[PDB]
């Protein structure tokens, strides 16, 4: 009982219907923060820590995040796993690779939406 | 003190010989045999290779080889040699393949030899043990041990999961024979065959089938192989061979042995005592002409078989002495 | 279920043995080549893989090995994780980190045995 | 202390006992072989240095007996130096007596934990050295791992104060013929020193081990 | 299940206060040559505290048990 | 039949009004530490309600039992 | 196809080009000799059988290789 946000539609939210392909790839939450969805993470943002094509990796739904710890954060119309690195009115998309750059953010005119916690990555 | 350890030791060897019979220790003087009772395998390359001149008796024997190697054809020189001497001799077979009438032509005194085949592996085995332990039989040849099928495999249905069921009955059944047969000088001769093994990655492949319990009992495991075949020119009549002693308890090991099979005529011992004693210098050929005690013996080695042939008594002698200068 | 039966080591090898540590939840088929079960890293030879120390490593039991891919090889007591590269007498066993130098093995003189092929890894 | 020795066919455990039992004999103890498959040649020991007269053999039938025999002669406190042949070979009573291919499965581990447990008390107490030497069986549904399992039941690792594995690497030849063969001895478990101390060394024919060459 | 069962009977699992299950799983070596080895102790039953809280410690032959290693 | 027997002589199963059969066969495991284990009881007997109406509920340490669990 | 016992003519072009996925990812020049051999023995081994039940008629494409050494 697990979902699998493989496809994610630009302008749809995180746990959307349309957006769980399931397939029977379906295994048990056992994971500590206790995710509640299965996210595929695509592009080279985090090849530094092991993000990959690939790597479904679980997420928990929750909205909470403390120093340099990683979260699925929103930006309305694109979802994106990065570091999160508070700077007291802006946060910091921080990733690991020499040509993406710490994405800059800020909260006054945009906050993001924390959508869960990244806890768990499968390569599969 | 030492004599209170002794007075000790004979108390313990007393209570031993009075509870279990008279099998603590081994009588000194008893037990000193020249040499280890050994069967000839008829054929002077095994007989000098093993150093005991034969087959070890009472202890298993294993001989394993590839397809058409000459394994059963050997069993049955080794098994025609034990009737001459005078011993009975029993044949149980698994995969059902035996012509008497070409056993009988190799030497075999088929009217008197006990031909089991048994339909199932545990049968084969128990039929051994009875045969053992009944102290009659002097040589015991047990045929394709890749061919014991349990009898679980043949009442189950063909694919079913049986992995290791038949390593099991082969480690069991040789813990049980290997007992009896010491007690009744008997020789067991199993004969398995080659079955390549998989992800070996490098070197010899070659595995031999039936489990591994079998090569610790093994007291001298053969290795047969079939080197090239012998041509008059347009037929083949016989099959050089190459037997290898991959293992042994009673001489050193690896002492390869190599001879000619004649189809129908048996082994070729003619012609190895010839090739033995050309090398020992008892006889002489400069460069191509065999020659014997300064008399030209003839030209080629089917003429000296002849010349030999015509006089068995120079024969045995060559024989005796050969094996008096290498067996001993 | 994919028990845990033992860990292999991402870099040098060390002893590994069959004793099962604990039982994961995930279906047996969740991997391609239907993984069996489990082996803990050890280390950090396969960073630049993705493959860091303290991650279930799935893998699947093959005798086979084939150039470039990975697999879990057996030294004799001592199981370690490598790139297989065979050329003849000689195995050359890639790490994908300069810091941890190429293994070569000669198959003449000491044996080589695969225990298998990784399918993924966990990370939990 | 229980001694166990494993390995291989044709690796070196009998050669290996046979020549400590020479070195007990020298030192000038009494020693004594309880075969168990019926298998030694009392020609290659007497070559190996060993007293043969001086040593006592036994051909025990069954498990029971070739286990309560050794049990005596520990008791007897006069042998200092006790060698089963095979621990594979110790055909429980019960097994022999049955016909073949049964269910008799765990008698002869059951039988191997009983004499351990009557024999260890006795033995530190008789100051006594039994060696038990084992063989080699694949265990299945192993997969990772060593597949390698001693055979005759998991009592007698506890027990055993330091366990060998002796394996047979190389040949040592004079160009043509084979007169000897290169072996590996691996403490694999110890209680008096630190374990995995592999130690290498040749067995000649005939002359026993190559002390010689080890000492250059 | 699990086929590993101790011995001496099951009168003294009952009694037992806290039973411990130690496996040896690695080994240390300094170079080549193994001085030490890598255990694995897991509480599996517990009357003073909640069970399985396995312990991982590096044991070293001589020195005993490598605590400074674990304070590190 | 069944081997498994209780102890303290058979004057016990006579008198004894309702006997529970209390065995723990799961445990619930948060992540990856076990806080707490799945007990099922089996009123093996009784003498004022039908016997067999076995029970499964949840025991968390430290807790207790689990009551919300079950309740829902 | 063949299982769905619907399409009774599958032709299949270019037997040469089926190169094996295990050779695909594979650098250029590997000796990766057989393979591809292997691949099709088990194919045709594989659905040898499933055309008899259908109607279907498999038409596979070769193409022409020299072959070197004996040149009888
Ligand atoms: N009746 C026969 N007539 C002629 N040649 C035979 C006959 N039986 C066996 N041979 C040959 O004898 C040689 C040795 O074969 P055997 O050892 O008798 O049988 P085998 O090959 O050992 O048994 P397998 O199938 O290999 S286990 C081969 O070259 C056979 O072709
Ligand atoms: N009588 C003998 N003459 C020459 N070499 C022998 C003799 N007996 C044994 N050997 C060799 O001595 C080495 C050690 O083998 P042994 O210890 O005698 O037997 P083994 O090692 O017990 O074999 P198993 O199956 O383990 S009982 C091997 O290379 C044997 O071939
Ligand atoms: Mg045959
Ligand atoms: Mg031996």
New interface residues.
């Given amino acids: 009982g697990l979902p699998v946000i493989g496809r994610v539609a630009a302008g749809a939210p995180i746990l959307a219907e349309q957006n769980i392909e399931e397939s029977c790839r379906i295994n048990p939450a056992f994971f500590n923060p206790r995710a509640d969805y299965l996210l595929r993470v695509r592009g080279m943002a985090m090849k530094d820590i092991g993000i990959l094509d690939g790597d479904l990796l679980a997420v928990h739904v929750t909205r909470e995040a403390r120093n340099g710890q990683v979260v699925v954060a929103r930006i309305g119309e694109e979802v994106t796993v990065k570091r999160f690195k508070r700077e007291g009115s802006k946060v910091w998309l921080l990733a690991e690779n020499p040509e993406f750059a710490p994405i800059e953010v800020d909260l006054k005119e945009q906050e993001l939406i924390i959508e869960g916690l990244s806890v768990g990555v499968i390569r599969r | 003190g030492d004599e209170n350890?002794?007075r000790?030791?004979a108390?313990?060897?007393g209570?031993?010989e009075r509870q279990?019979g008279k099998?603590?220790?081994?009588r000194?003087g008893d037990?000193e045999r020249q040499a280890?009772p050994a069967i000839s395998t008829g054929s002077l390359g095994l007989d000098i290779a093993l150093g005991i001149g034969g087959l070890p008796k009472?202890?298993i024997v294993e001989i394993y080889g590839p397809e058409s190697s000459g394994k059963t054809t050997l069993t049955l020189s080794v098994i025609a040699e034990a009737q001459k001497q005078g011993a009975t001799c029993a044949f149980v077979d698994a995969e059902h393949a035996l012509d008497p009438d070409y056993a009988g032509k190799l030497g075999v005194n088929v009217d008197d030899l006990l031909v089991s085949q048994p339909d199932t592996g545990?049968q084969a085995?128990?039929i051994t043990?009875m045969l053992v332990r009944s102290n009659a039989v002097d040589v015991i040849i047990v045929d394709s041990v890749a061919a014991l099928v349990?009898?679980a495999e043949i009442e189950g249905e063909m694919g079913d999961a049986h992995?290791?069921l038949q390593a099991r009955?082969m480690?069991?059944?040789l813990?049980?024979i290997?007992?009896n047969?010491?007690?009744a000088n008997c020789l067991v001769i199993f004969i398995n065959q080659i079955r390549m093994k998989?992800?070996v990655?490098?070197?010899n492949p070659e595995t031999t089938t039936g489990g591994?319990?079998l090569?610790?009992?093994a007291?001298v495991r053969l290795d047969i192989r079939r080197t090239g075949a012998v041509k008059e020119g347009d037929e083949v009549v016989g099959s050089e061979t190459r037997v290898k002693v991959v293992?042994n308890?009673?001489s050193?090991?690896?002492r390869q042995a190599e001879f000619q099979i004649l189809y129908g005529k048996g082994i070729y011992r003619t012609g190895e005592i010839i090739d033995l004693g050309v090398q020992l210098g008892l006889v002489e050929k400069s460069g191509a002409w065999y020659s014997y005690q300064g008399s030209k013996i003839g030209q080629g080695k089917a003429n000296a078989a002849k010349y030999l042939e015509d006089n068995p008594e120079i024969g045995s002698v060559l024989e005796k002495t050969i094996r008096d200068q290498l067996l001993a």
């Fill in positions: 350890k002794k000790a030791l108390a313990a060897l209570q031993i279990f099998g603590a220790v081994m000194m037990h280890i009472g202890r545990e085995l128990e043990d349990p009898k992995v290791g009955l480690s069991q059944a813990r049980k290997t007992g047969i010491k007690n998989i992800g990655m490098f070197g591994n319990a090569k610790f009992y007291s293992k308890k009673v050193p090991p690896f």
